[PDB]
């Protein structure tokens, strides 16, 4: 229905706003664009499902997220990819892991404060009906 289309539109607006706030944070610059194959040639072979905040924005716009739960799976993917690809004890790896965890925690904290649980429940029930 039109009311359900309005619901998903509000969802997309909410998700774009959260994603923009993550993307403008200096700590998360490394997660804003896909990894350059020339800079890191073995990334595509190690990480089977690359994800980044520009890709998340594209997915929002392609109507790929019908719930905030599905959005958070891609945020979690950004984080887990970073922890997997940069597992070493050296400062470079520890910095990126710390930032990855901060991205995840920040996304979840914004959602905890600003997502109405009944709005999410409506989205899930529309999704489940389709
Ligand atoms: C996302 C990402 C980027 C990167 C760039 C250079 C070296 C290592 C890297 N690891 C990453 O996880």
UniProtKB/Swiss-Prot annotation:
What subcellular locations does the record give?
Nucleus
Residue ranges occupied by any Bromo domain in the UniProt entry: 3-114
Q: What induces it?
A: Up-regulated in breast, uterus, colon, ovary, and stomach tumors. Induced in breast cancer cells overexpressing NCOA3 or treated with estrogen. Down-regulated in 5-fluorouracil-resistant derivatives of the colon cancer cell line HCT 116.
Which regions form coiled coils? 108-130
Name the tissues where it is expressed.
Highly expressed in estrogen receptor positive breast tumors and in osteosarcoma tumors.
Query: Superkingdom, according to UniProt?
Result: Eukaryota
Q: Which family does it belong to?
A: Belongs to the AAA ATPase family.
Quaternary organization: Interacts with ESR1 and NCOA3 and these interactions are enhanced by estradiol. Interacts with acetylated lysine residues on histone H1.4, H2A, H2B and H3 (in vitro).
The task this protein performs is described as: May be a transcriptional coactivator of the nuclear receptor ESR1 required to induce the expression of a subset of estradiol target genes, such as CCND1, MYC and E2F1. May play a role in the recruitment or occupancy of CREBBP at some ESR1 target gene promoters. May be required for histone hyperacetylation. Involved in the estrogen-induced cell proliferation and cell cycle progression of breast cancer cells.
Q: What is this protein called?
A: ATPase family AAA domain-containing protein 2
Q: Which residues of the full protein are shown?
A: 981 to 1108 of 1390
């Amino acid at each position: 229905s039109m009311q359900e289309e309005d619901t998903f539109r509000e969802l997309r607006i909410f998700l774009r706003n959260v994603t923009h706030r993550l993307a403008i944070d200096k700590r998360f610059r490394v997660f804003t664009k896909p990894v350059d194959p020339d800079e890191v040639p073995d990334y595509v072979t190690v990480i089977k499902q690359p994800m980044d905040l520009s890709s998340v924005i594209s997915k929002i716009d392609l109507h790929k997220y019908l719930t905030v739960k599905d959005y958070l799976r891609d945020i979690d993917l950004i984080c887990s990819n970073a922890l997997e690809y940069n597992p070493d004890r050296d400062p470079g790896d520890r910095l990126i892991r710390h930032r990855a965890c901060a991205l995840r925690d920040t996304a979840y904290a914004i959602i905890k404060e600003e997502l109405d649980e009944d709005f999410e429940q409506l989205c899930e029930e529309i999704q489940e009906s389709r």
